[PDB]
Write a protein that holds these residues in place. Sequence first.
Motif, PDB file in Angstrom:
ATOM      1  N   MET A  78       0.820  -1.218   0.000  1.00 56.76           N
ATOM      2  CA  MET A  78       0.000   0.000   0.000  1.00 56.76           C
ATOM      3  C   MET A  78       0.854   1.269   0.000  1.00 56.76           C
ATOM      4  N   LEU A  79       1.951   1.271   0.758  1.00 58.38           N
ATOM      5  CA  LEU A  79       2.860   2.407   0.823  1.00 58.38           C
ATOM      6  C   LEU A  79       3.600   2.581  -0.509  1.00 58.38           C
ATOM      7  N   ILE A  80       4.139   1.488  -1.055  1.00 57.67           N
ATOM      8  CA  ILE A  80       4.889   1.470  -2.318  1.00 57.67           C
ATOM      9  C   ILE A  80       4.030   2.025  -3.458  1.00 57.67           C
ATOM     10  N   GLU A  81       2.800   1.535  -3.590  1.00 56.00           N
ATOM     11  CA  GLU A  81       1.903   1.959  -4.664  1.00 56.00           C
ATOM     12  C   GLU A  81       1.386   3.386  -4.490  1.00 56.00           C
ATOM     13  N   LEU A  82       1.178   3.850  -3.254  1.00 59.57           N
ATOM     14  CA  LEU A  82       0.865   5.260  -3.024  1.00 59.57           C
ATOM     15  C   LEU A  82       2.013   6.170  -3.470  1.00 59.57           C
ATOM     16  N   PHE A  83       3.259   5.784  -3.181  1.00 57.71           N
ATOM     17  CA  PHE A  83       4.429   6.512  -3.665  1.00 57.71           C
ATOM     18  C   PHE A  83       4.568   6.448  -5.181  1.00 57.71           C
ATOM     19  N   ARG A  84       4.268   5.310  -5.820  1.00 61.29           N
ATOM     20  CA  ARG A  84       4.256   5.179  -7.286  1.00 61.29           C
ATOM     21  C   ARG A  84       3.290   6.165  -7.947  1.00 61.29           C
ATOM     22  N   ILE A  85       2.109   6.370  -7.360  1.00 63.96           N
ATOM     23  CA  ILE A  85       1.095   7.303  -7.883  1.00 63.96           C
ATOM     24  C   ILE A  85       1.476   8.768  -7.610  1.00 63.96           C
ATOM     25  N   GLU A 139       7.840   6.252 -13.654  1.00 65.60           N
ATOM     26  CA  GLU A 139       8.725   6.266 -14.827  1.00 65.60           C
ATOM     27  C   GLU A 139       9.996   5.402 -14.651  1.00 65.60           C
ATOM     28  N   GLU A 140      10.114   4.652 -13.547  1.00 67.02           N
ATOM     29  CA  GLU A 140      11.259   3.776 -13.225  1.00 67.02           C
ATOM     30  C   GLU A 140      12.617   4.506 -13.131  1.00 67.02           C
ATOM     31  N   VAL A 141      12.599   5.819 -12.893  1.00 65.31           N
ATOM     32  CA  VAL A 141      13.803   6.634 -12.682  1.00 65.31           C
ATOM     33  C   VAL A 141      14.311   6.490 -11.243  1.00 65.31           C
ATOM     34  N   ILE A 142      13.381   6.350 -10.302  1.00 63.77           N
ATOM     35  CA  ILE A 142      13.625   6.051  -8.891  1.00 63.77           C
ATOM     36  C   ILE A 142      12.997   4.694  -8.581  1.00 63.77           C
ATOM     37  N   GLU A 143      13.738   3.852  -7.882  1.00 58.94           N
ATOM     38  CA  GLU A 143      13.296   2.530  -7.449  1.00 58.94           C
ATOM     39  C   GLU A 143      13.158   2.503  -5.924  1.00 58.94           C
ATOM     40  N   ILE A 144      12.050   1.944  -5.424  1.00 55.20           N
ATOM     41  CA  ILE A 144      11.895   1.620  -4.001  1.00 55.20           C
ATOM     42  C   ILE A 144      12.502   0.231  -3.780  1.00 55.20           C
ATOM     43  N   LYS A 145      13.598   0.160  -3.022  1.00 58.08           N
ATOM     44  CA  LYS A 145      14.333  -1.085  -2.760  1.00 58.08           C
ATOM     45  C   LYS A 145      13.776  -1.878  -1.586  1.00 58.08           C
ATOM     46  N   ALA A 146      13.297  -1.182  -0.562  1.00 58.27           N
ATOM     47  CA  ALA A 146      12.725  -1.802   0.627  1.00 58.27           C
ATOM     48  C   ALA A 146      11.693  -0.877   1.270  1.00 58.27           C
ATOM     49  CB  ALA A 146      13.860  -2.157   1.598  1.00 58.27           C
ATOM     50  N   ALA A 147      10.719  -1.474   1.956  1.00 56.59           N
ATOM     51  CA  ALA A 147       9.722  -0.765   2.742  1.00 56.59           C
ATOM     52  C   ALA A 147       9.434  -1.541   4.033  1.00 56.59           C
ATOM     53  CB  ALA A 147       8.461  -0.562   1.897  1.00 56.59           C
ATOM     54  N   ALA A 148       9.525  -0.859   5.170  1.00 57.15           N
ATOM     55  CA  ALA A 148       9.181  -1.392   6.484  1.00 57.15           C
ATOM     56  C   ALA A 148       8.101  -0.520   7.111  1.00 57.15           C
ATOM     57  CB  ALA A 148      10.437  -1.462   7.353  1.00 57.15           C
ATOM     58  N   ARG A 149       7.095  -1.136   7.739  1.00 56.23           N
ATOM     59  CA  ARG A 149       5.873  -0.424   8.123  1.00 56.23           C
ATOM     60  C   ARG A 149       5.276  -0.933   9.428  1.00 56.23           C
ATOM     61  N   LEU A 189      16.887   4.035 -17.789  1.00 56.63           N
ATOM     62  CA  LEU A 189      18.164   4.686 -17.519  1.00 56.63           C
ATOM     63  C   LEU A 189      19.084   3.682 -16.844  1.00 56.63           C
ATOM     64  CD1 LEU A 189      18.767   7.699 -18.187  1.00 56.63           C
ATOM     65  CD2 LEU A 189      16.296   7.324 -17.985  1.00 56.63           C
ATOM     66  N   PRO A 190      20.042   3.095 -17.560  1.00 50.82           N
ATOM     67  CA  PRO A 190      20.865   2.031 -16.978  1.00 50.82           C
ATOM     68  C   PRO A 190      21.926   2.538 -16.023  1.00 50.82           C
ATOM     69  CG  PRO A 190      21.665   2.531 -19.127  1.00 50.82           C
ATOM     70  CD  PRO A 190      20.428   3.372 -18.952  1.00 50.82           C
ATOM     71  N   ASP A 191      22.800   1.634 -15.586  1.00 56.23           N
ATOM     72  CA  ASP A 191      23.916   1.997 -14.732  1.00 56.23           C
ATOM     73  C   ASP A 191      25.246   2.094 -15.467  1.00 56.23           C
ATOM     74  OD1 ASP A 191      23.372   2.450 -11.834  1.00 56.23           O
ATOM     75  OD2 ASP A 191      22.313   0.538 -12.031  1.00 56.23           O
ATOM     76  N   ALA A 192      25.367   1.533 -16.667  1.00 55.72           N
ATOM     77  CA  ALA A 192      26.588   1.628 -17.459  1.00 55.72           C
ATOM     78  C   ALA A 192      26.251   1.360 -18.916  1.00 55.72           C
ATOM     79  CB  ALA A 192      27.654   0.638 -16.966  1.00 55.72           C
ATOM     80  N   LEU A 193      27.154   1.752 -19.816  1.00 54.00           N
ATOM     81  CA  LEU A 193      26.978   1.568 -21.256  1.00 54.00           C
ATOM     82  C   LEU A 193      28.354   1.310 -21.860  1.00 54.00           C
ATOM     83  CD1 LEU A 193      24.764   3.672 -23.663  1.00 54.00           C
ATOM     84  CD2 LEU A 193      27.186   3.781 -24.016  1.00 54.00           C
ATOM     85  N   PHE A 194      28.482   0.231 -22.615  1.00 56.68           N
ATOM     86  CA  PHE A 194      29.767  -0.173 -23.170  1.00 56.68           C
ATOM     87  C   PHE A 194      29.917   0.420 -24.568  1.00 56.68           C
ATOM     88  CE2 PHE A 194      33.044  -3.304 -24.399  1.00 56.68           C
ATOM     89  CZ  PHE A 194      33.829  -3.237 -23.273  1.00 56.68           C
TER      90      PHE A 194
END
Lengths: 492, 50, 105, 157
Positions: free
Chosen positions: A204-211, A218-228, C36-41
Amino acid sequence: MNKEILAVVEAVSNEKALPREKIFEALESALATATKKKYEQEIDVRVQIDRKSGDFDTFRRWLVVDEVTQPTKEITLEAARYEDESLNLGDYVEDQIESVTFDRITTQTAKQVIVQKVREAERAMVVDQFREHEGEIITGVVKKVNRDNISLDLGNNAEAVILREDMLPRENFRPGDRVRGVLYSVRPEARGAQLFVTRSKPEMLIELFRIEVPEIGEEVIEIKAAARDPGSRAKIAVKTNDKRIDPVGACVGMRGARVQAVSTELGGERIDIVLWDDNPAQFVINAMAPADVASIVVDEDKHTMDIAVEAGNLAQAIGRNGQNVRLASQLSGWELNVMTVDDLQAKHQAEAHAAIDTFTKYLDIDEDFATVLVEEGFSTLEELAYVPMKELLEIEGLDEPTVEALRERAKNALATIAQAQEESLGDNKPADDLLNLEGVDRDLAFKLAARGVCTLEDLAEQGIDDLADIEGLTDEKAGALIMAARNICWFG
Amino acid sequence: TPEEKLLRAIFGEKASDVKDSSLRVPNGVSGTVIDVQVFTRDGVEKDKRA
Amino acid sequence: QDGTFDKLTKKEALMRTRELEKLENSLGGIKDMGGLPDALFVIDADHEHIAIKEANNLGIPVFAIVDTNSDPDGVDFVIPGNDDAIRAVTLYLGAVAATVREGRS
Amino acid sequence: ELQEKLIAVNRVSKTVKGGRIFSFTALTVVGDGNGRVGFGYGKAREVPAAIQKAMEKARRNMINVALNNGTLQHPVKGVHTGSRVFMQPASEGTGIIAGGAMRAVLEVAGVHNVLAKAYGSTNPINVVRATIDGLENMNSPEMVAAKRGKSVEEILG
RNA sequence: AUGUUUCUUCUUUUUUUUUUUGGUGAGAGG
RNA sequence: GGCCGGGAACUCAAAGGAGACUGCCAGUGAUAAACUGGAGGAAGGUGGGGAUGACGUCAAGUCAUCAUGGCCCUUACGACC
RNA sequence: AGAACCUUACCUGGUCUUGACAUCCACGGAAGUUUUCAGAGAUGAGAAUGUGCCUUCGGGAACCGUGAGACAGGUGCUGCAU
């Protein structure tokens, strides 16, 4: 009449986007079931609807089988082939039977089966098309509030459930309220709710942040972990591959507007946003925010980390009821021990003294030489017994003969400790008492005694949960052995 | 209704939402049928039991 | 793969396959990349100079095989080696594939 | 966060056979106030879009200056094409004055004690290139104790 | 080859719903 | 006198569509684009034609289609024959 | 996309000025209707007679007069005021 069947098939096919064939198969099954109910005897019945006229013929079906168990619905392959040589196992033999008049009874049965077919076709395809919603934050209207669950209406005859554990602790919903939640499970159960919605889980937290944060969508920032801790506090760890973007600043937004929108939807839950680091120690420092960490000691073997803080920051590092350390531990996956700088030094001095005492006692070395081994990083007899000879030869004052002698003493000490454990229980105690329990092999008795279960009484006092980690002991076998031990100790 | 167009199709011989009722008789009394009389106005086809 | 012809005229859809294929080979199998990757060869920096320009503005560490004619003004990892061979670039590609065999676990 | 501060507005045109369309060159600056400074170049066909398109480059142009005690390090030359501005030291002079259309730039670095004087031609465009370029080759005493001497503390006395 | 004079302008603040199967005649039970 | 029967073939009458796309063949040309011949067809390369007038220039015309800020008449420049 | 009256806004002459047309204020006339005229026509000078429906039946909407009017009227100007 005739043309009306075609008009109904076309209307239903177009409105529900459903194959006409699936609607007819279901009407045939509905009419067969309605026919079966008019006879006092249990008969088998096939109905066939003509796809052009809408006319229908009803049979006395006879399931062609190898062995007949039900003579009223089944026929042998030999008897079926006497009527039609083309019939195989699983085909139906028919019998000219009067088709049931289409009264409002059959009409109601046909309507019910069509509705059920639409649930397994139109509604099923709608759920398939909403693959995002099955996982993202669906929106429902509260239809009913019970003590243990909330029923949501999603529209289109779809009902979802929020369980009591899936709600936030302070939420009070009324019938007619709009509620958002993550669809975390879809169950194809024949009865009950099929759609399970959560507001308490981390998704629920991850998807609220996605919206709320476009950079996550846009997959420019990734959520790696969430603790709640639901309705109280959460931590999220964020990473980006773009060095031009601050991932924490993006998730906070202008003056915290984005994180406050998510917090408001979660009933005022406090959200900490931390930078993900690939170094575990640096990641734990970030996870411990807002407490300042003075030093970290990492125990890789126990998967634990000792965190030293200033005495003024100790209460902040632990948090209310240990909430900060628990959320940091859940976010990192590490067990986190928070102490003062003075307590960490006292712990290390006590561990060093215990290692020196152990080495002096078991290796027959002086305290000065035991201190050098601890200063070079050796804390256990196992490290000294098994570490590569090159690392022991890097220590100033160790020669190849002395390292070999030290390893032989460490191995002999480990063997003497293992034998003294086996003699304390496994050569007398678990070789007679715990062994008596039918099923205990000598290996299992030594594994039990290594956990402090030395006697048949000690085993009778255990739960299945206390023994679940013993390699080769299934919950069923643990339960059988505990019951055998109890039968001897308490009922002998 | 769509279903009602199929109710008009196959056995629409059953009017529409039909409920064709025979002389479904009521309750309150048991018995044993001892004697049956059938009188026929002349001209009408006698059935097999008459 | 199932429809794409029964919704308009047949003349239109070969322009679509022209649009599909020339954007298939030129967008590659990179549609399921992380964007947007982490490296490009980089194999050669003569006319792919726009990349090593663009890969430097976001702080992304990117490699470079160099030959005699190109300049190191912008690349990070200058590795020497001739850019005109068939098996040798795959010997380079077999070498990194040994690392990428560790680059999954 | 980004602590916006916006300054510039003036028309530029194109003069096509249709006519001359007034584009709007607009400049600003973005920074934390505690070390990260960097700007963007923006223009549009109106005023409010140009100050928004200049934002995205300023997100990726932030360059650090190792802010020592919220001021400079030592007198550096901000000479660039059109302006030759000095960065005069004033160690807690408690006066925040710099050049015209440079003052609003040096609020976003955070400082409170420095002197300046835009030598040459009074242009607002060479300022924001130079007032980072003056800040760029500037280094705190640690880094120029990290290279010269090879004894950090001896230049520190 | 010739073609006045005085004359053009430029962008960041305004916006509530919503609706108050009857009659008659005879017999009988309490 | 299609005038009087007859007819649903047929012109005409009027609808929903079928019909055209460089689809096919060969030379040439950078396996592309593409020109143009060969074919059949009612028509061959946007089959003939119309409708649709991009951003904009003339700060092009109109206050006399209508609207409309100022201005003046409002015993008149308004109204009637 | 049609200049005998008209159209016509231009001109001559003869005319009313709260007015060709609109809404409202007080009261009257009911409304209606044919015809004799000073006169180029306009306008203005007259005679015979009539009176549907609602009736809260101390009178009102549909039509005009005379008087105060607010206004009404503008093909009078500005197309570089839109």
